[PDB]
Write a protein that binds this ligand. Structure first.
Ligand SMILES: *[C@@H]1O[C@H](CO)[C@@H](O[C@@H]2O[C@H](CO)[C@@H](O[C@@H]3O[C@H](CO[C@H]4O[C@H](CO)[C@@H](O)[C@H](O)[C@@H]4O)[C@@H](O)[C@H](O[C@H]4O[C@H](CO)[C@@H](O)[C@H](O)[C@@H]4O)[C@@H]3O)[C@H](O)[C@H]2NC(C)=O)[C@H](O)[C@H]1NC(C)=O
Ligand SMILES: *[C@@H]1O[C@H](CO)[C@@H](O[C@@H]2O[C@H](CO)[C@@H](O[C@@H]3O[C@H](CO)[C@@H](O)[C@H](O)[C@@H]3O)[C@H](O)[C@H]2NC(C)=O)[C@H](O)[C@H]1NC(C)=O
Ligand SMILES: *[C@@H]1O[C@H](CO)[C@@H](O[C@@H]2O[C@H](CO)[C@@H](O[C@@H]3O[C@H](CO)[C@@H](O)[C@H](O)[C@@H]3O)[C@H](O)[C@H]2NC(C)=O)[C@H](O)[C@H]1NC(C)=O
Ligand SMILES: *[C@@H]1O[C@H](CO)[C@@H](O[C@@H]2O[C@H](CO)[C@@H](O[C@@H]3O[C@H](CO)[C@@H](O)[C@H](O)[C@@H]3O)[C@H](O)[C@H]2NC(C)=O)[C@H](O)[C@H]1NC(C)=O
Ligand SMILES: *[C@@H]1O[C@H](CO)[C@@H](O[C@@H]2O[C@H](CO)[C@@H](O)[C@H](O)[C@H]2NC(C)=O)[C@H](O)[C@H]1NC(C)=O
Ligand SMILES: *[C@@H]1O[C@H](CO)[C@@H](O)[C@H](O)[C@H]1NC(C)=O
Ligand SMILES: *[C@@H]1O[C@H](CO)[C@@H](O)[C@H](O)[C@H]1NC(C)=O
Lengths: 209, 49, 50
């Protein structure tokens, strides 16, 4: 299936404080009013990565627990793994495949840390994995939310495909990022309050000009 | 470097000016915000006969 | 609007009443005075660039 993006996916592009300005920057952004694939959980198909992934999830009890990343994903090359087991967050890059634990009655890197909508942006730039996130108490809602950076990792391995992980005893949306130019509005406190996609319609091109 | 009172976000490190120049920094040891001002202005007016 | 003056060689038109019109004219006179510095603008607090 498909559904509208509804002006979502705007994150902070850097670590620079700006106050009450309109800044035009070009980066990997989700295009406005675009198509995102909707999957329903009562399925976790293998999907590609491309230049980046906007992963939104509407949940009430955190059914989605994490993601797996890699190129082959068959215990052949390095495969990244994000797992939240409701106490801490585990990041691995090991090859070993583990079955999903039911919740009824060699690698050189490892890190240990409907009412809810959790939005994440994953992108791999010059061998660095960047994860931006935003969790809000709530098709996607037509509101503007700015995604703050949480996770930066020096991983290095290429990632071309990914797959989500479910807590098998809620729905999610997947979109792809594109190189786009955005006009962002920084208020008095350095928060991104609104954005304009410069290549959507001629009115926004006039606004960006 | 001068003591400042800018409200930096917790993930932000630098503040930028109108000229996209660095105006505020965050010290990496003591997490405080410091403003950067020039050394001294050179242009003074001289009124003389 | 298209107009056509009723012209003939024995007819004249003379006003019998008037009006007093006070109109507005706006004229710029001066602008902002600015001044520049060489080293503060170009390099700025840099001895070797100066
Ligand atoms: C040459 O032109 C001048 C002005 O252009 C005329 O002189 C006088 O003009 C005034 C204004 O028109 C006449 O006074 C009264 O005007 C009222 C309308 O007022 C509105 O418009 C004016 C601007 O024109 C605004 O300031 C005002 O706030 C209003 O928005 C009419 O309602 C009056 O009529 C009443 O009085 C007459 C008697 O005068 C009654 O017969 C009516 O029934 C009514 O009760 C009035 O017209 C003033 O009357 C003009 N003077 C004279 C002597 O008529 C000249 O008339 C004109 N011609 C010549 C030959 O000089
Ligand atoms: C869910 O995931 C967490 C995260 O790994 C598991 O909890 C335990 O987390 C600690 C993080 O500090 C792991 O490290 C160990 O900590 C102890 C004491 O802090 C320290 O002495 C060790 O040297 C080591 O650093 C610990 O390995 C991990 N426990 C296990 C068994 O892996 C938690 O177990 C997971 N499961 C559940 C049901 O919560
Ligand atoms: C940027 O953030 C600052 C916070 O440091 C804002 O300043 C203050 O913000 C509060 C709202 O959070 C304003 O309301 C006040 O709230 C307190 C606590 O609830 C209450 O006791 C007061 O009676 C008042 O209602 C407060 O007026 C405001 N103060 C000033 C000096 O601005 C600031 O507004 C933010 N700027 C933005 C969002 O543009
Ligand atoms: C980087 O390391 C420095 C140590 O050189 C850390 O500074 C230390 O911060 C703690 C914060 O709790 C200070 O403890 C408290 O300080 C207050 C005021 O000085 C005092 O009244 C309390 O009784 C308590 O001692 C500690 O003094 C301070 N040490 C120094 C030498 O300034 C700093 O927090 C570290 N920064 C990061 C980002 O890790
Ligand atoms: C699993 O372990 C082996 C052996 O430690 C890793 O092999 C690397 O092999 C190359 C050439 O054979 C060596 O130059 C490297 O030094 C080895 N790596 C290390 C860390 O010693 C292999 O890469 C490991 N695989 C994963 C996914 O961690
Ligand atoms: C976008 O979604 C709409 C509605 O689901 C669909 O009609 C259209 O074909 C989609 N376009 C692309 C390029 O996927
Ligand atoms: C990623 O792909 C590029 C080009 O295909 C390759 O040069 C690079 O070695 C790959 N990265 C890793 C970690 O193998």
């Amino acid at each position: 299936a498909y559904t509208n993006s509804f002006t979502r996916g705007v994150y902070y592009p850097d670590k620079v404080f700006r106050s009450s300005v309109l800044h035009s920057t070009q980066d990997l952004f989700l295009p406005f009013f675009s198509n995102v694939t909707w999957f329903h959980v009562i399925d976790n198909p293998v999907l590609p990565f491309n230049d980046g992934v906007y992963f939104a999830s509407i949940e009430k009890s955190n059914i989605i627990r994490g993601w797996i990343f890699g190129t082959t994903l068959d215990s052949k090359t390095q495969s990244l793994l994000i797992v939240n087991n409701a106490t801490n967050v585990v990041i691995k890059v090991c090859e070993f495949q583990f079955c999903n634990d039911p919740f009824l009655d060699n690698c050189t890197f490892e890190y240990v840390s409907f009412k809810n909508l959790r939005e994440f942006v994953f992108k791999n730039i010059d061998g660095y994995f960047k994860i931006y996130s935003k969790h809000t108490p709530i098709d996607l809602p037509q509101g503007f939310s700015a995604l703050e950076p949480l996770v930066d990792l020096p991983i290095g391995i290429n990632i071309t495909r990914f797959q989500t992980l479910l807590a098998l005893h809620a729905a999610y949306y997947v979109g792809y990022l594109q190189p786009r130019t955005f006009l962002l509005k920084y208020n008095e406190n350095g928060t991104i309050t609104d954005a304009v996609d410069c290549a959507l319609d001629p009115l926004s091109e006039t606004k960006c000009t | 470097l001068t003591e400042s009172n800018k409200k930096f976000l917790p993930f932000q490190q630098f503040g930028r000016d109108i000229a996209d120049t660095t105006d505020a920094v965050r010290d990496p040891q003591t997490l405080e915000i410091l403003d950067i001002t020039p050394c001294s202005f050179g242009g003074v007016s001289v009124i003389t006969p | 609007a298209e107009n056509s003056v009723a012209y003939s060689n024995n007819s004249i038109a003379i006003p019998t009443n008037f009006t007093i019109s006070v109109t507005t004219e706006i004229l710029p006179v001066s602008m902002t005075k600015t001044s520049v510095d060489c080293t503060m603008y170009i390099c700025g607090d840099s001895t070797e660039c100066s």
